[PDB]
Amino acid sequence: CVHHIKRRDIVLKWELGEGKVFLAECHNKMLVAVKALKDFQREAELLTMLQHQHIVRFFGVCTEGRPLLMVFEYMRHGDLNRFLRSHGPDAKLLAGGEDVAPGPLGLGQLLAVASQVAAGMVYLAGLHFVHRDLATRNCLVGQGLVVKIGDFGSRDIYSTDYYRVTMLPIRWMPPESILYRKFTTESDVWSFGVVLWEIFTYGKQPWYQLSNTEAIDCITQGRELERPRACPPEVYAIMRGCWQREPQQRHSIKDVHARLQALAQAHHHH
Ligand SMILES: CSc1sc(-c2cc[nH]n2)c2c1C(=O)N[C@@H](c1ccccc1)C2
Ligand SMILES: [Cl-]
């Protein structure tokens, strides 16, 4: 069951973003990310259950005093959207003096990021668990290019990624989810294809040239996102497999993961 942590053992340092999420040190020294909220019990049991190398580690709860706390591992390099944007074509301009080898991520690194998000989605699909909000803003980066699926639904600095209908991430959603709120492992695989597009554009917002209502019309009409400049044709063919109009015609996350792993392996020594 759910592991409990004594409040005395949690020493807050500062805030990370907004429910408030803080950086802290935990005893039994160790860095951690702590979630404090102003449904908790259901989530605690769920997060104790979801255990995988590519799912952010949950350590337990603090159910003594106010607020109630949720303890997670600290992911140094932050959210995957910010990481992509800061390790993109303009990385040299954006980098601080001390930054190590500033520049855009190469093909091998982009494929290793994509494969780790896919591995996490393979685990969730095997458990018949539907994420509903897969996007780079919901993935986290740790030291050594370790990528894990974080939040399950964001940090408010990404409010522009949601449309009010109850906030929906319409740009990552297939037509059946936009029209009927039909969420399945097949709508998550569509969102995965959009994550691939975000990765290969270094964090651009999908349909950035369009407003929310223009994006809804394009998606429901069957328009597909253009191939990114850094995207090889074989990676775009994977995106297209995720974007089949009929949910049952979409490739399974398992085959997508196997294809990305096969492409990563063939590029390792080059
Ligand atoms: C190094 S920066 C960082 S590490 C980190 C985290 C979370 C679990 N481990 N590590 C978070 C953040 C951040 O930029 N935003 C925080 C957030 C706030 C509200 C909602 C969703 C996300 C989460
Ligand atoms: Cl193709």
From Swiss-Prot:
Effect of residue 242 to S: In CIPA; following transfection in neuroblastoma cells and NGF treatment, decreased percentage of cells differentiated into neuronal phenotype and reduced neurite length compared with wild-type; slightly decreased N-glycosylation; reduced expression at the plasma membrane; reduced basal and NGF-induced autophosphorylation; small reduction in NGF-stimulated calcium flux
UniProt modification remark: Ligand-mediated autophosphorylation. Interaction with SQSTM1 is phosphotyrosine-dependent. N-glycosylated. Isoform TrkA-I and isoform TrkA-II are N-glycosylated.
Chain positions of motif DXXLL: 29-32, 90-94
Active site, UniProt feature: 133
Induction text: Isoform TrkA-III is up-regulated upon hypoxia in cells normally expressing it.
Family note: Belongs to the protein kinase superfamily. Tyr protein kinase family. Insulin receptor subfamily.
Assembly and binders: Exists in a dynamic equilibrium between monomeric (low affinity) and dimeric (high affinity) structures. Homodimerization is induced by binding of a NGF dimer. Interacts with SQSTM1; bridges NTRK1 to NGFR. Forms a ternary complex with NGFR and KIDINS220; this complex is affected by the expression levels of KIDINS220 and an increase in KIDINS220 expression leads to a decreased association of NGFR and NTRK1. Interacts with SH2D1A; regulates NTRK1. Interacts (phosphorylated upon activation by NGF) with SHC1; mediates SHC1 phosphorylation and activation.
Name of the protein this chain belongs to: High affinity nerve growth factor receptor
Record lineage: Eukaryota, Metazoa, Chordata, Craniata, Vertebrata
